[PDB]
Amino acid sequence: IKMKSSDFLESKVSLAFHRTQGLMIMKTVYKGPNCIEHNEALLEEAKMMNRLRHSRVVKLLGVIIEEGKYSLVMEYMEKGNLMHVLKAEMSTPLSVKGRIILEIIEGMAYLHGKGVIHKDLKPENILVDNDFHIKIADLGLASFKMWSKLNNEEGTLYYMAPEHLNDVNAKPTEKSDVYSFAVVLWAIFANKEPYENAIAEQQLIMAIKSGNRPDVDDITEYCPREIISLMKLCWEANPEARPTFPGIEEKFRPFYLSQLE
Amino acid sequence: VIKMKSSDFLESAELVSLAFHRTQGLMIMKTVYIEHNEALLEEAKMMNRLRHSRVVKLLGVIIEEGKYSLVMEYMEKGNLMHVLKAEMSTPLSVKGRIILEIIEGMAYLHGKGVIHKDLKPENILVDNDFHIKIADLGLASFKMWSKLTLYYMAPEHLNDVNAKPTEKSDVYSFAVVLWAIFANKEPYEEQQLIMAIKSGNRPDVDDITEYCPREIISLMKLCWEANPEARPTFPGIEEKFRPFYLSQLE
């Protein structure tokens, strides 16, 4: 699982070419003074990332732990993130959008089943391959404590549950990821980011905390009536009222097979 | 649009940077930052069409491969709040002219189908002669370049980010600028205040200790009416305020 920087041809998210295994994605996280006290915990977190093995989760291919330099190596996803694909000038049919929603659900159920709270689910953390299959990613390292710590030693809020806005000590839960899935759902059918009419961040933060949600009327594409009810269910103000991902998969999978696929 | 190069500038200093152009003088540069380019250039081509004596002009754009910058004309005295708080006094006649120039600038923008949406004293810049220009520091009007305070927000946009701003949203902002011009300070010296504003709270008129003509108090109250329908338009304000300024204030 551990690699060396010299395992890569010579040229912060970059395309990298490993000398034997080929094209990969490299994110160098820290390039400063030595800090080897963190190293066993960083290595154990990398091993936890590497044990996340599921078709809808980006695989960690390697970790570089060098005396001044820490890097994570991931597999490459050819088509970029969900928002870029939704905005490409070829249209994405309802059947493919339905499949993507189910795969996001499958990936998120798997992560929650492994005791992982994503904490930063958004269209940019949903990557797409050539066949329009998706994998969940963590570009800002929001999910693993020590790597997030190392990233910050010396982000968009459209998808943040309202309980976390203006609250640095609220602990993210499974219901915080369910909130983010709701707005991603809205984005998949609007083909754009929400809240285009916001003027100021404090206006948007306070509006969302008081009950503002993405404009369902701004979906001019056909959006099945059950998916509008799903997003509204998932962005409920009270987290206890939000469903779980296994619960979402149990209602959305038959609906996807009978109507959308 | 004029496209410019970073090699066209001698000196830079942060302040958004003040830059010294090789021929055209002092300028303000905001470095903001290939999928983006024809639309990014088209927004700039559109900004450049705002040509008016009371609106800050886009002089050029720098599209370099690690660098995206907007170049604006420089306003020597900074923004309106900085000028109102200086201990050199601003007589009523200069305050009246400033109000009329804000109106001219706002009428011109609306005439071009531009809704400012963020009118406030920080977006009102002042030159050496105390003439003003309307600016958009937060890039609030052009989406993609913005892609790269609530005291002046009309109550219909408070706790409602999906309502579409109108010309009447700028008239509300004008009203609070009026109050600030005569108090020489920001008003309301958030969820509690937001709700009070949504139910009718306004800046305290009794907190204006400077002399303030009766017509400007009534205009202020007219322009900040809860119902957007009751607020005048800027051409409507100009027909009442231009003769009033000439006969009483100038």
Ligand SMILES: C[C@H](NC(=O)c1cn(C)c2ccc(-c3ccn4nc(NC(=O)C5CC5)nc4c3)cc12)c1cccc(F)c1
């Ligand atoms: C183990 C996994 N950790 C990660 O996923 C990542 C963590 N960090 C810091 C990353 C940084 C970049 C990428 C990434 C990976 C692949 N690609 N592929 C393209 N493709 C194009 O840009 C195309 C040209 C247009 N971009 C990317 C970007 C991933 C991760 C994970 C952990 C926890 C929860 C999870 F859910 C998942």
Ligand SMILES: C[C@H](NC(=O)c1cn(C)c2ccc(-c3ccn4nc(NC(=O)C5CC5)nc4c3)cc12)c1cccc(F)c1
């Ligand atoms: C075309 C025009 N676009 C803009 O207005 C600006 C857009 N962006 C991003 C800007 C960033 C900075 C400035 C700016 C310009 C000049 N000055 N001058 C001083 N002076 C002093 O700082 C102190 C005394 C020393 N500051 C400044 C700051 C302007 C703009 C516009 C568009 C739409 C509606 C409008 F109404 C106007």
